Subunit: 387 residues, 4 copies
């Protein structure tokens, strides 16, 4: 049951199942995986594709002949399996040179190098067929107030993304960018900490149509926010270019639990929203099998990401299709929420005594919203307990 197919567009970062288990307090618990073995194992589970940072595919500092051989082996694995590469990204956070940032490092020489490292990998991404190029600026930010002038850093962050936009336009590439917010970790505070801040920043870029967001479930939950609500705002803005799926238990260090773990009802409402809205992009998992696990547990945890998406898809579809839920949605006036407040226009609203002098505020206030019965129908559908 719930068996994924490439049809389902489930994708995984090489760094997810390949995470060796090093954490702030502990050494690696698993050996490194060859990307070829991750591609073949993920295909065997029913994944559609993988994604990569440059330095997951090509060891940092590789010669041009080494780079060619790493890419060649990876492409043979993709060809052998039918796996795709819909997204790629740059590692601008692991090497010590990026300790104060890539695009917003205080040192100008580092900002220029970060751009050249990104541009080299955009070319590779396009060669592998990627539609989206993610940027998670995990080193952009500060531990102390004097270290980082945030208006100057936003100027540098806009300059960088504008230059990347100029680059892909000049090359005629169709790729687009997706900025991934995170509120903190590894910096004490990270710039563009939420979906909202990233959406607002994009509006000030010179070619705003080339940029969207890549929200991650656990990152918005590290600020205690409602992830389905933030995805709804991204969809409303036409900017949900990609998404990272995982689980998180509230306001903690980024746990990257498998999808469906962490906040299970937020996972249900997220899948309901993605499917209702017809989101067509990859269902990408940015997760880490816990370092307690051996490789059988790695593949079990990856299989669980896809299984939980598919169970939640079934239950959310059954909820929306149930004539009792449709009745309850009408009882709670979800249909009215979708109607214009005043398609009659401002002067008609001003002249309408039923909106002011003749509005019976106490009779309106007496109407219950019936939200609790609606939510218990939703709980019963999620748990398969209708009856």
């Amino acid at each position: 049951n719930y068996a994924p197919t490439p049809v389902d567009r489930f994708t995984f970062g090489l760094w997810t199942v390949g995470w060796q288990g090093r954490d702030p307090f502990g050494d690696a618990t698993r050996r490194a995986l060859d990307p070829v073995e991750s591609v073949r194992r993920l295909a065997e589970l029913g994944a559609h594709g993988v994604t990569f940072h440059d330095d997951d595919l090509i060891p940092f500092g590789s010669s041009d002949s080494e780079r060619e051989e790493h890419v060649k082996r990876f492409r043979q694995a993709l060809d052998d399996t039918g796996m795709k590469v819909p997204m790629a990204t740059t590692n601008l956070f692991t090497h010590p040179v990026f300790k104060d940032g890539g695009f917003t490092a205080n040192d100008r020489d580092v900002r220029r190098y970060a751009l050249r490292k990104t541009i080299r990998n955009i070319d590779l991404a396009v060669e592998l067929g990627a539609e989206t190029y993610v940027a998670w600026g995990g080193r952009e930010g500060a531990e102390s107030g004097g270290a980082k002038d945030v208006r100057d850093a936003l100027d540098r962050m806009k300059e960088a993304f504008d230059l990347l936009g100029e680059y892909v336009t000049s090359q005629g590439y169709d790729i687009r960018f997706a900025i991934e917010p995170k509120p903190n970790q590894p910096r004490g505070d990270i710039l563009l900490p939420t979906v909202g801040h990233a959406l607002a920043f994009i509006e000030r870029l010179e070619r705003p149509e080339l940029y969207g967001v890549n929200p991650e479930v656990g990152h918005e939950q590290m600020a205690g926010l409602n992830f389905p609500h933030g995805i709804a705002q991204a969809l409303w803005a036409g900017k949900l270019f990609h998404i990272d799926l995982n689980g998180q238990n509230g306001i903690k260090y980024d746990q990257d639990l498998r999808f469906g773990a962490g906040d299970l009802r937020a996972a249900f409402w997220l899948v309901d929203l993605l499917e209702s809205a017809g989101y067509s992009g990859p269902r990408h998992f940015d997760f880490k099998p816990p370092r307690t696990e051996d490789f059988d547990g790695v593949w079990a945890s990856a299989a669980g990401c896809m299984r939980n998406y598919l169970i939640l898809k079934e239950r959310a579809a059954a909820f929306r299709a149930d004539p009792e839920v449709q009745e309850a949605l009408r009882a709670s006036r979800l249909d009215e929420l979708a109607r214009p407040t005043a398609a009659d226009g401002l002067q008609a609203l001003l002249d309408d005594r039923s909106a002011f002098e003749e509005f019976d505020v106490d009779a309106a206030a007496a109407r219950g919203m019936a939200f609790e019965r609606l939510d218990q129908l939703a709980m019963d559908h999620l748990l398969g307990a209708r009856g």
Copy 2:
């Protein structure tokens, strides 16, 4: 020492010093204050002005003769004291009719009434001289996932603010709007939960130049965010039309402590940023004297809001003026952060071997940022401990 003057543009909501102390668990501990007495007492402390919700000034449901008399008494108090009214707002949260929202209530009749209540008070705000009209949509949101379709709610929230924009344009008013984000409370999740989400939403309004943000210190801290960073993004966007100053101890219910309480170093870095950026708007306090206090404690807590701003202003100015701090800012390359990454342009950056093949990443990585000595100079200046 630190004695406020109206010059300092310190303002207070009528609902702040007038808060009677009712909380989720407890009855009022203070009697209601007449707005005239709050205006006279605040002037005696050195405040510049007050602000109001409609229903703080005019009891809900007042007749037109009652409304005139309440306004007349209030204007006499303003005239008697020289106090100004730079900002006003609508109460779209206390009356039970607004339990599922004003502008985004599921019931259309409530959304139309919320607009008419707002428009009536915009006219009053303009008559009293206000430059800014705030909107804190504290009832816009949900406790459960099925209750509120957030894309439909954002459509209604845009329709409402567009109609308000049309209204003030049609009347030739110069007032502008400031949206106040909050992440939760009293709804389980509130729409536009952070400065970023509000800035992004404003970009999609039909007349975006008429709207900015009114960020509140404690609200961004209820999501664990860095308030000075969010104010920097609002300033970068040209949208800091007003601000609410108070204190908060992290991720809790909205405490509205006096300014300087809560996160004291974030208060220091906020004042440093406002003064360095030349913010010219009111320094408005949205705070609550704790319900443990009698009226002498109310006025002590209000005086403390202004005193702590002025102490922090002195210390931040001394920090920025100290030639040792200016040296440390250069040692940490804050001057380079303010320089363009690539004013030579994209082709020059691509052709520059010093940005890639000849960049010595290990020598760059070895350079310390000297951020800790800079931050200890900042701590010494805040505490008046230089030496």
Copy 3:
């Protein structure tokens, strides 16, 4: 399906379904309920019993004849329905006299009054058959550091609970006390903020056997803690005398959502633990139907508390009974965790080369824990998706 019976020992506070909907920002949305109507409606849903604060049953300041009549009507309702009253408590938080606390108010006269108000209601609790007397010290704490010397407050808090212990011993009552922790709200920080702090405090009382804890799901989650883990420590200590069940979405104001809402997998693991441990006390709901609801939504939300407990009970029992889960528990060495580390004793452990010189740390480190497959079996059982 899932239909509660009094057999299930589900109980509700009068203040839960009776909450009129006043919140920090809004007036009441429902009229007050007569306790007699709440008793009859809850019985109709299949509840076992109710609980009360003194001032939920007897309006504050009632004459002795008024008190008798309120109690008489309530007892007739209990007799008419078979409902029980297993728990009662004191309101030491709503009246303004308790603004700095009851037992730990700085004013000694208030501390003495708080004790006399408690003792009067202990007598009533015993007359109504209650086995447990809860104390939630929601006003014990502070908004500022100088206001409350916490060592002196703990001395006063111990003196108070010791005097209550002396009182019930002297009267030959069998009732016991259950202290309810909460980390904050309505005070900026509350004393005894978690289950751990309350358990530790109890150990220093003069008659420690008379006191346990009354943990509440949402309160421990307001500190981001694992509620099932805290209940496990309370059970380990023999101190889980009562429990408050509800839902909460992380680090926020106390939301008191219906049980099963909020963190659904924590609700599953809580029910698994209570049932496995054979907890025999009431399954008490301390929740609030959201103020969006009319009275039909109040009773729907109360019915949902019991329904979600029963669904989770079924799924947790099926998980524990499944021979595949029992196999996975052995694969993850849960059986070894329950065995003594060194029943052979310290000298045997010191002399055992297999514990040190001959322990193969790399072979041990290579063993995976298989926790992810175990957790996905748990997810499949919760969602009714086995297959």
Copy 4:
């Protein structure tokens, strides 16, 4: 000014200034330090002593001759500088064998090895003069509910600490243990997550007098708790055997900022409490110079830990010594809080009409607490702004 002396008992872990900067996302930014160089540099700053995990001093897997030489060099450095070693601890978290715990690993063989590794280092600690042996069980806990039966884990955790108690009694050692709580990280939830849970657990050990707590500022703040309040409960219980000082910005990953950073007013109230209570133990820093820093920034950050303690000590002493603050403490009835509620005894309290029938609750409720003026005197003293 504020120059530390060994008199001040400031101590540092070898792992603090020696932290090489590896974090969940980034490689080391500094080379490893020889413990001899850390001892000499810390002495040059005015530190009193250092502390160590076994594997900070002796590389894991060292031969007995290697172990002797590492210890010999370290002792020469201590002798050359007058530095002391008041505390030591075991690393039961870095090596992969401890991925599910040391004392509460599900695998029994790992639990026995963890005890033997601890006992070997207790002997070394005693040889170096340590008075306290800390245990931070950072791997004790779980990411999923089925993985760890917490009652069984607490049985194993008690068995382990009982065996350690038996060991030091049998050897006639005077050392005592201090358990360090942390709520999460690196496990999804850690057992004994707060000071309260650790204090409660200690009460159930067979020799409770041998164990106290080692609270860390940032760990309690990762649960949003008030660290000075938790230290007050530990002092009240007679269990503050050691303390870890650092800074933290709220509910995040463990940041280990230098002391005084993070929540500055909580640092003030902590120092006020330690000094007022006469705490006589080490003022130990468990902190990390940010990985942005080179070694000059490491020593600047360590110097700042001690400087901020000494500035806060001066300001807290001035606050307590100020006759205006003493007056305000009396105005807020802190003197009454320290008096018994009912030294006249229970029967006298029951018979006292001034505690019930004749208590004027409205006159009591009208009395303000004057806490805001007291707190602004505290703010003025912290900032050196009196006047």
